[PDB]
Design an enzyme around this catalytic site. Structure first.
Site, mmCIF file in Angstrom:
data_model
loop_
_atom_site.group_PDB
_atom_site.id
_atom_site.type_symbol
_atom_site.label_atom_id
_atom_site.label_comp_id
_atom_site.label_asym_id
_atom_site.label_seq_id
_atom_site.Cartn_x
_atom_site.Cartn_y
_atom_site.Cartn_z
ATOM 1 N N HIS A 147 0.816 -1.218 0.000
ATOM 2 C CA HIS A 147 0.000 0.000 0.000
ATOM 3 C C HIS A 147 0.848 1.266 0.000
ATOM 4 O O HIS A 147 0.324 2.350 -0.269
ATOM 5 C CB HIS A 147 -0.993 0.009 1.173
ATOM 6 C CG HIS A 147 -0.403 0.452 2.473
ATOM 7 N ND1 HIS A 147 0.134 -0.426 3.392
ATOM 8 C CD2 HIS A 147 -0.242 1.689 2.999
ATOM 9 C CE1 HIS A 147 0.592 0.254 4.428
ATOM 10 N NE2 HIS A 147 0.390 1.543 4.208
ATOM 11 N N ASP A 197 -0.095 -7.605 2.025
ATOM 12 C CA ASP A 197 0.385 -6.228 1.868
ATOM 13 C C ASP A 197 1.912 -6.238 1.863
ATOM 14 O O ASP A 197 2.572 -5.970 2.870
ATOM 15 C CB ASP A 197 -0.157 -5.371 3.002
ATOM 16 C CG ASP A 197 0.119 -3.899 2.813
ATOM 17 O OD1 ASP A 197 0.534 -3.479 1.713
ATOM 18 O OD2 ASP A 197 -0.091 -3.166 3.792
ATOM 19 N N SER A 224 4.037 3.167 7.803
ATOM 20 C CA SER A 224 3.697 2.174 6.794
ATOM 21 C C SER A 224 4.931 1.638 6.094
ATOM 22 O O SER A 224 5.792 2.400 5.653
ATOM 23 C CB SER A 224 2.799 2.828 5.737
ATOM 24 O OG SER A 224 1.482 3.011 6.207
HETATM 25 N N1 LIG Z 1 -0.812 0.670 13.381
HETATM 26 C C1 LIG Z 1 -1.312 1.726 12.704
HETATM 27 N N2 LIG Z 1 -2.123 2.649 13.189
HETATM 28 C C2 LIG Z 1 -2.420 3.697 12.214
HETATM 29 C C3 LIG Z 1 -1.622 3.251 11.022
HETATM 30 C C4 LIG Z 1 -1.452 3.845 9.777
HETATM 31 C C5 LIG Z 1 -0.667 3.229 8.817
HETATM 32 C C6 LIG Z 1 -0.048 2.019 9.098
HETATM 33 C C7 LIG Z 1 -0.206 1.424 10.339
HETATM 34 C C8 LIG Z 1 -0.989 2.046 11.307
#
Ligand SMILES: NC1=NCc2ccccc21
Ligand SMILES: *[C@@H]1O[C@H](CO)[C@@H](O)[C@H](O)[C@H]1NC(C)=O
Ligand code: NA
Ligand code: NA
Lengths: 250, 11, 28
Positions: A43, A99, A198
């Site tokens: 993503h 992902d 991310s």
């Molecule tokens: N663990 C997570 N909380 C909000 C978020 C946004 C993006 C990826 C992971 C997370």
């Protein structure tokens, strides 16, 4: 990272920053798995609901970093991408199943005190360590709070959560290609990944051979550090045959 | 609010 | 890969980081 701390120098030498060329900005975390290959979340590169579909030439990877915003002269190394590979069954439509993505670098990066690859788990290391209560470590330059940004790489240690608790925390369909981690409300302690983290790694230090293994990829969560919610991570071992296929053929 | 990177990487 | 997961500034010098013991203590 919410409720983490500043990383030590060289604490996560496999950390990679995905960096957009124009406008110059952080896109995601990632990890170094060899001198030519970087692992991230699909993503980070492809998310059509947000009109996100990056090509190789849109991106750079920055390796060896500590400061979020500085150009860390004589320490960090900046690499261009040869090719992106996204899992062919990555499910961006529903729940981010599978992902995972790989990025091959145009030229090999030189290892240093600040640049070094993480191991990927074997079946036995995954079976031994991916147990509820066992803690891993998440690192990134993402937001410090849900609704702000760090000067340097942040680190937080978080326990793996029992699968029924993960499932019962959300309306999203959880698959065997995901695990969740974080503290429960009555455990007191806190911590989560947040926007910008991310694609970074969830690592564990094997007590059998004293090596760090990447068990997860920061994938998704409902808010950042919300009580009763958990962070979700791509299950790297479950997707390792695809990883190996890509590397063994490109 | 990022420091400019060397132009050699953007070419 | 042969050297993967061994950090130059920690494992390779037998130095521990400030919180890795928290991980070890969870591996019961
Ligand atoms: N663990 C997570 N909380 C909000 C978020 C946004 C993006 C990826 C992971 C997370
Ligand atoms: C993503 O973009 C590439 C070209 O850059 C294209 O081949 C691919 O089909 C696109 N995928 C989606 C879902 O838009
Ligand atoms: Na549910
Ligand atoms: Na939470």
């Amino acid at each position: 990272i919410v409720e983490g701390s500043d990383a030590e120098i060289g604490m996560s030498p496999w950390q990679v920053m995905l960096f957009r060329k124009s406008p110059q900005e952080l896109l995601c975390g990632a990890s170094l798995i060899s001198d030519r290959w970087v692992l991230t979340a699909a993503h980070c590169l492809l998310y059509p609901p947000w009109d996100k579909n990056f090509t190789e030439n849109d991106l750079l990877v920055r390796i060896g970093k500590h400061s979020r915003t500085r150009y860390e002269r004589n320490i960090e190394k900046i690499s261009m991408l040869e090719k992106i590979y996204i899992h062919p069954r990555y499910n961006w439509r529903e729940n981010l199943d599978r992902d995972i993505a790989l990025m091959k670098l145009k030229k090999p990066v030189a290892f240093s005190d600040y640049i070094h690859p993480v191991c990927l788990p074997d079946r036995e290391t995954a079976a031994s360590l991916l147990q509820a209560g066992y803690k891993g470590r998440v690192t990134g330059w993402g937001n410090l709070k849900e609704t702000g940004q760090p000067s340097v790489l942040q680190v937080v240690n978080l326990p793996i959560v029992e699968r029924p608790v993960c499932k019962d925390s959300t309306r999203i369909r959880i698959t065997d290609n995901m695990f969740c981690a974080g503290y429960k409300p009555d455990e007191g302690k806190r911590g989560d990944a947040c926007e910008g983290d991310s694609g970074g790694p969830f690592v564990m230090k094997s007590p059998f051979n004293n090596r760090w293994y990447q068990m997860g990829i920061v994938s998704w969560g409902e808010g950042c550090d919300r009580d009763g919610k958990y962070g979700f991570y791509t299950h790297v071992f479950r997707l390792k045959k695809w990883i190996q296929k890509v590397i063994d053929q490109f | 609010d990022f420091e400019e990177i060397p132009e050699e990487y953007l070419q | 890969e042969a050297d993967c997961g061994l950090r130059p500034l920690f494992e390779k010098k037998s130095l521990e980081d400030k919180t890795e013991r928290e991980l070890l203590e969870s591996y019961i």
